[PDB]
Design a protein around this ligand. Structure first.
Ligand SMILES: CCCCCCCCCCCCCCCCCC(=O)OC[C@H](COP(=O)([O-])OCC(O)COP(=O)([O-])OC[C@@H](COC(=O)CCCCCCCCCCCCCCCCC)OC(=O)CCCCCCCCCCCCCCCCC)OC(=O)CCCCCCCCCCCCCCCCC
Ligand SMILES: CCCCCCCCCCCCCCCCCC(=O)OC[C@H](COP(=O)([O-])OCC(O)COP(=O)([O-])OC[C@@H](COC(=O)CCCCCCCCCCCCCCCCC)OC(=O)CCCCCCCCCCCCCCCCC)OC(=O)CCCCCCCCCCCCCCCCC
Ligand SMILES: CCCCCCCCCCCCCCCCCC(=O)OC[C@H](COP(=O)([O-])OCC(O)COP(=O)([O-])OC[C@@H](COC(=O)CCCCCCCCCCCCCCCCC)OC(=O)CCCCCCCCCCCCCCCCC)OC(=O)CCCCCCCCCCCCCCCCC
Ligand SMILES: CCCCCCCCCCCCCCCCCC(=O)OC[C@H](COP(=O)([O-])OCC(O)COP(=O)([O-])OC[C@@H](COC(=O)CCCCCCCCCCCCCCCCC)OC(=O)CCCCCCCCCCCCCCCCC)OC(=O)CCCCCCCCCCCCCCCCC
Ligand SMILES: CCCCCCCCCCCCCCCCCC(=O)OC[C@H](COP(=O)([O-])OCC(O)COP(=O)([O-])OC[C@@H](COC(=O)CCCCCCCCCCCCCCCCC)OC(=O)CCCCCCCCCCCCCCCCC)OC(=O)CCCCCCCCCCCCCCCCC
Ligand SMILES: C[C@@H]1CC[C@@]2(OC1)O[C@H]1C[C@H]3[C@@H]4CC=C5C[C@@H](OCCC(CO[C@H]6O[C@H](CO)[C@@H](O[C@H]7O[C@H](CO)[C@@H](O)[C@H](O)[C@H]7O)[C@H](O)[C@H]6O)CO[C@H]6O[C@H](CO)[C@@H](O[C@H]7O[C@H](CO)[C@@H](O)[C@H](O)[C@H]7O)[C@H](O)[C@H]6O)CC[C@]5(C)[C@H]4CC[C@]3(C)[C@H]1[C@@H]2C
Ligand SMILES: CCCCCCCCCCCCO[C@@H]1O[C@H](CO)[C@@H](O[C@H]2O[C@H](CO)[C@@H](O)[C@H](O)[C@H]2O)[C@H](O)[C@H]1O
Lengths: 57, 87, 53, 383, 106
């Protein structure tokens, strides 16, 4: 009725602070894993060159 | 404003306690008496110093109510008794 | 042809985006709950039992 | 789970058929254990067979060493099948609870009958053989899962709090592993990320140094009877035997890929015996396979290569983390619009409260300025 | 050049890109009052982080699809000098192709 309740009350602020940091840590890691991915596609000039060769030019 | 109590402090000064980092610091440099953000926290000097927070009428931009799906957890068990029910 | 090639990756990216949205929504819900708790704390109308609940 | 009259009727009706089934299972399990024991004594390492002594460095108390006193029989498939090992494990649980009840009966004579009435009214400590139909078995499994839910969080919190209060991780990867180990079951933990915690904790507390209270929590979470607990080397022996059998079966399954061919119900049972898949979660085959594969990955390549599993304390915490449900939150957010201290409104504010409101209210800056100016004037006048 | 068409992937959930964008707009619209701007060198907020992640994924998907809206892609996807160079190379190429097509039709 008295003792355990008081010590639970004492624990609340630190646990709240640590869990807020843990949540921020998760969000930070989520952002850090994001990285714009640029793709490379076959240049059309080689297509235009193969087109020309096929013509027997 | 009302006369109701706030988060208990135990008569401690949060600017010099062993868990001071757990209490946010305001612009004036006075650490809060609670995990919450307090704008008007003060310190009083009796034989020992103690932190005090005075409730006041302050408006805070209220984010709209979320859906019950994203904050309700239906993991209650027969042995479980909530803090309100225990009180 | 290009669309047919870049199709599984697009589907995975869309699913990942949906999962990310569903992951962020609870965070905003917790933020709103904390805002309301702070509002009641500043008024002096917040018991520790309610905060723990 | 709490006792009920319906369960009491169920267990009283199936009492004698249950006892007969338990006796038959006892004969079968004795045969299986005899095969396994003969193989262990014949082909086991010298330290394992001779029961080498490992003492703690502080009080020199003997306890089972995971490296020396546990041995994975890689060639057990020749003599004993996977299903037989599962049968032996299930029988070991049932036999432990039955043995405790029989000991109580022998100790207290006929005065244990009312306690037997309390016993048959709950499925927590009755054997699985007492269920003769699917629905009864489902309720029994629900009771076991409820006990696991009740007991596991205390074990996890004990481990985490003691370590965090008395030690910290060495490097960032260990920090991430330790933090992600104790996440709730609503999120999926990557075994590769979490594995380093095993070595980190091996530096702190090996299975040979596990404390008696932590052992009691673990045995509660494993549905192992804990009264009378006695010395920690009895229930510790039970834990070691159970997980040694589990690791033998795991090696068999991993090597022969039995889980892929394993049917849905048998797969669910296999996960459940590893404390990975609660029945109340209504998992499908995809989720069960995901959890089982994560368990195998957590065991790691070294398990297959040399039969060496990670630290047993961390392994138990990892698997029991599936019973660490998110903290319950019930009630609409509109309930946060109410007030908690309306009953004090009639009292008003006394002189001291009014003074505090005046000094720390919106006019606090003006009051501070006036007070400081007055004090400065008085100090100047005094000088 | 590409090789083999990649293995087929089955979606875990069903949702359209338009629906996803609308959901993102709704999610970010309710926090506009709470959202506060700050200097680029200052630490970011939760709302800013969520907006950046969601918009980055959305516009990466759009650019892969073909909706080459450079005005927003330069805002929600550019975070590296290499990224800026790639965007400039892509910005020139699309304009050149458009001009060539128009000239070849005229
Ligand atoms: C009539 C007088 C009575 C005296 C008073 C008694 C008072 C009550 C005290 C308790 C008495 C025992 C109760 C019955 C237990 C059931 C039998 C048994 O041992 O089960 C195995 C099981 C073994 O447990 P374990 O942890 O796996 O053992 C680890 C070993 O490594 C396991 O070895 P392993 O890993 O190599 O595997 C072997 C395993 C492999 O086997 C199998 O896998 C097959 C299954 C075999 C076991 C089956 C057990 C079934 C239990 C249920 C029975 C049905 C109940 C039905 C109920 C309803 C009835 C209507 O087989 C075994 O389990 C063999 C264990 C060793 C034998 C123990 C028996 C020794 C005593 C009997 C001989 C006495 C001779 C007297 C001679 C007199 C000379 C002057 O026993 C238990 O669960 C332990 C008992 C739990 C309660 C403990 C209570 C405190 C005890 C304190 C005693 C202190 C000394 C006495 C004085 C007390 C004063 C305060
Ligand atoms: C036919 C059947 C088949 C054949 C038989 C088969 C064999 C059967 C036997 C074996 C069965 C084993 C399994 C049993 C499981 C059930 C155990 C149990 O009790 O569960 C709790 C059970 C309910 O269990 P549940 O609902 O299923 O929940 C289980 C959960 O999992 C909750 O689980 P939990 O883990 O949370 O609960 C555990 C809890 C278990 O405990 C309890 O739950 C406590 C139960 C009692 C609570 C009483 C509350 C009410 C008090 C009323 C007071 C009187 C009111 C006014 C009456 C006015 C009348 C006019 O705590 C403990 O385990 C503590 C253990 C303590 C051990 C103490 C050891 C002492 C050793 C001494 C030191 C020695 C040192 C060495 C010295 C050496 C020297 C040389 O409690 C009850 O049902 C309460 C019954 C209350 C009866 C009425 C009040 C007492 C009446 C007394 C009448 C006296 C008449 C004569 C008077 C004469 C005067 C001259
Ligand atoms: C606000 C006011 C309210 C009222 C308050 C009342 C006043 C209280 C004042 C003082 C209270 C504190 C006293 C503490 C004393 C010191 C305790 C101590 O040193 O403990 C050391 C130590 C601590 O216990 P532990 O094993 O470490 O774990 C205890 C945890 O609670 C284990 O917890 P766990 O979570 O690990 O396990 C949970 C679960 C786990 O479940 C299981 O393990 C499965 C089920 C197991 C069933 C039991 C198996 C027993 C196997 C054999 C045990 C050895 C027998 C030895 C020979 C027999 C000696 C008689 O276990 C249970 O649920 C246990 C159920 C037990 C129910 C009985 C509890 C007592 C209720 C009252 C009934 C008796 C009334 C008699 C007086 C009235 C007469 C008219 O105790 C032991 O080593 C246990 C030895 C047991 C020896 C037998 C009992 C000896 C005492 C004499 C019995 C007399 C019987 C009379 C029959 C009727 C005659 C007419
Ligand atoms: C209602 C019934 C009432 C019953 C009353 C009787 C008492 C209770 C009965 C039993 C109650 C149940 C629970 C008991 C405790 C359980 C302990 C436990 O969990 O052990 C697990 C443990 C199993 O684990 P494990 O891994 O297999 O082996 C342990 C590891 O080695 C562990 O490895 P470690 O690294 O820990 O190694 C250390 C370990 C090494 O030890 C062991 O573990 C080995 C087993 C014990 C060996 C003890 C014998 C040592 C040599 C004795 C030499 C005496 C020579 C004297 C010659 C005289 C010539 C004139 O421990 C020691 O070193 C301790 C040694 C003992 C020191 C004794 C000091 C006493 C000082 C006396 C002060 C003064 C007294 C008053 C004045 C008297 C004179 C005027 O069990 C055992 O090892 C044996 C347990 C035996 C239990 C007791 C059986 C009771 C039988 C009762 C018969 C009489 C009944 C009378 C009834 C009367 C009417 C009602
Ligand atoms: C309503 C009330 C009615 C009246 C009640 C009257 C009450 C009388 C008050 C006086 C009683 C004092 C004793 C209290 C015992 C409880 C202490 C306790 O639980 O501490 C927790 C304590 C704290 O553990 P922890 O802090 O969690 O962890 C620390 C360590 O890590 C733990 O790690 P660990 O477990 O590995 O290390 C411990 C272990 C390590 O060692 C081993 O593992 C090796 C085991 C070696 C066993 C050696 C046995 C030698 C036996 C020789 C017999 C020769 C045969 C002779 C035959 C002919 C003569 C009869 O060594 C032991 O603890 C065993 C030491 C020797 C046990 C001897 C049997 C018990 C004697 C009790 C009577 C003492 C005199 C009482 C009168 C004077 C009082 C001032 O844990 C233990 O000690 C666990 C073992 C507990 C076993 C003892 C209790 C057994 C149950 C007794 C059944 C009989 C019931 C009779 C009921 C009577 C009712 C009237
Ligand atoms: C802590 C509390 C204390 C009080 C209490 O609760 C726990 O203690 C509990 C202990 C209880 C007794 C335990 C055991 C029996 C025997 C049974 O008997 C079966 C029928 C026959 C045997 O089958 C009876 O035939 C006999 O057969 C014997 C040969 O076999 C002959 O010799 C004997 O003459 C002859 O009568 C009849 C019931 C009774 C008396 C119980 C009553 C209720 C309690 C007093 C409880 C009670 C509520
Ligand atoms: C009241 C007491 C109750 C006791 C209950 C438990 C009883 C258990 C009985 C098990 C019997 C096992 O039987 C026993 O097995 C061992 C191990 O394979 C055999 O052991 C044999 O092979 C081993 C291994 O190569 C040799 O080290 C040993 O020298 C040789 O005898 C024994 O020859 C046999 O007698």
């Amino acid at each position: 009725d008295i003792m355990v309740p008081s010590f639970v009350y004492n624990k609340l602020p630190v646990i709240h602070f640590l869990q807020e940091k843990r949540a921020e840590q998760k969000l930070r890691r989520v952002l850090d894993e994001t990285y714009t991915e640029w793709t490379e596609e076959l240049d059309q000039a080689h297509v235009t060159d193969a087109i020309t060769r096929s013509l027997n030019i | 404003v009302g006369n109701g109590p706030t988060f208990s402090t135990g008569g401690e000064c949060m600017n010099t306690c062993d868990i001071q980092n757990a209490f946010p610091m305001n612009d004036r440099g006075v650490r809060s008496s609670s995990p919450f953000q307090e704008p008007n926290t003060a310190i009083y000097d009796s034989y020992l110093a103690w932190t005090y927070f005075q409730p006041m009428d302050v408006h805070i931009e209220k984010l709209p109510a979320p859906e019950a799906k994203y904050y309700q957890r239906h993991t209650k068990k027969p042995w479980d008794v909530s803090s309100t029910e225990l009180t | 042809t290009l669309q047919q090639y870049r199709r599984a990756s697009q589907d995975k990216r869309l699913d990942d985006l949906v999962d990310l949205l569903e992951r962020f929504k609870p965070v905003l819900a917790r933020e709103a709950i904390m805002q309301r708790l702070t509002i009641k704390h500043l008024e002096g109308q917040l018991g520790v039992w309610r905060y723990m609940d | 789970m709490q006792g009920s009259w319906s369960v009491l009727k169920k267990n009283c009706s199936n009492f004698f058929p249950g006892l007969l089934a338990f006796a038959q299972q006892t004969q079968e399990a004795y045969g299986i254990w005899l095969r396994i024991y003969n193989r262990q004594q014949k082909y086991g390492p010298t330290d394992f067979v001779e029961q080498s002594e490992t003492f703690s460095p502080d009080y020199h108390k003997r306890f089972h060493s995971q490296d020396k006193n546990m041995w994975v029989d890689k060639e057990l498939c020749t003599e004993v099948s996977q299903k037989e090992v599962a049968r032996l494990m299930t029988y070991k649980l049932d036999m432990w609870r039955m043995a405790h009840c029989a000991g109580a009966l022998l100790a207290t004579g006929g005065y244990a009958i009312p306690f037997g009435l309390f016993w048959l009214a709950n499925d927590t400590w009755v054997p699985s053989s007492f269920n003769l139909t699917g629905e009864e078995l489902r309720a029994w499994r629900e009771a076991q899962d409820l006990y696991r839910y009740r007991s596991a969080p205390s074990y996890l919190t004990d481990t985490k709090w003691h370590f965090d209060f008395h030690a910290y991780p060495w490097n960032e990867t260990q920090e991430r592993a330790w933090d992600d180990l104790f996440e709730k079951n609503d999120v999926r933990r990557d075994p590769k990320v979490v594995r380093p915690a095993a070595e980190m904790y091996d530096g702190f507390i090996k299975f040979e140094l596990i404390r008696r209270k932590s052992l009691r929590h673990l045995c509660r979470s494993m549905n192992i009877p804990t009264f009378p607990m006695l010395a920690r080397l009895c229930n510790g022996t039970r834990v070691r035997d159970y997980w040694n059998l589990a690791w033998c079966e795991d090696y068999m399954v991993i090597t022969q890929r039995l889980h892929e061919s394993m049917t849905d119900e048998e797969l669910y049972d296999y996960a459940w015996r590893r404390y990975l898949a609660p029945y109340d979660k209504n998992l499908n085959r995809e989720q069960l396979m995901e959890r089982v594969e994560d368990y195998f990955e957590f065991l790691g390549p070294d398990f297959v290569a040399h039969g060496k599993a990670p630290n047993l304390v961390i392994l138990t915490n990892y698997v029991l983390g599936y019973y660490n449900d998110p903290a319950y939150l019930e009630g609409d957010i509109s309930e946060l619009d109410k007030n908690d201290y309306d009953h004090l409104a009639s009292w008003g504010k006394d002189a001291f409260l009014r003074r505090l409101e005046f000094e720390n209210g919106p006019l606090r800056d003006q009051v501070e300025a006036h007070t400081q100016r007055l004090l400065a004037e008085r100090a100047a006048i005094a000088k | 050049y590409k090789g083999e068409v990649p293995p087929h992937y089955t979606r875990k959930s069903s949702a359209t890109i338009e629906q996803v964008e609308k959901e993102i707009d709704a999610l970010l619209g309710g926090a506009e009052k709470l959202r506060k701007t700050s200097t680029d060198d200052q630490p970011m907020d939760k709302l800013t982080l969520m907006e950046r992640c969601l918009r980055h994924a959305l516009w990466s998907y759009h650019k892969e699809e073909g909706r080459y809206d450079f005005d927003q892609i330069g805002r929600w996807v550019v975070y590296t000098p290499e990224d800026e160079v790639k965007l400039a190379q892509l910005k020139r190429e699309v304009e050149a192709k458009e001009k060539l097509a128009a000239l070849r039709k005229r």
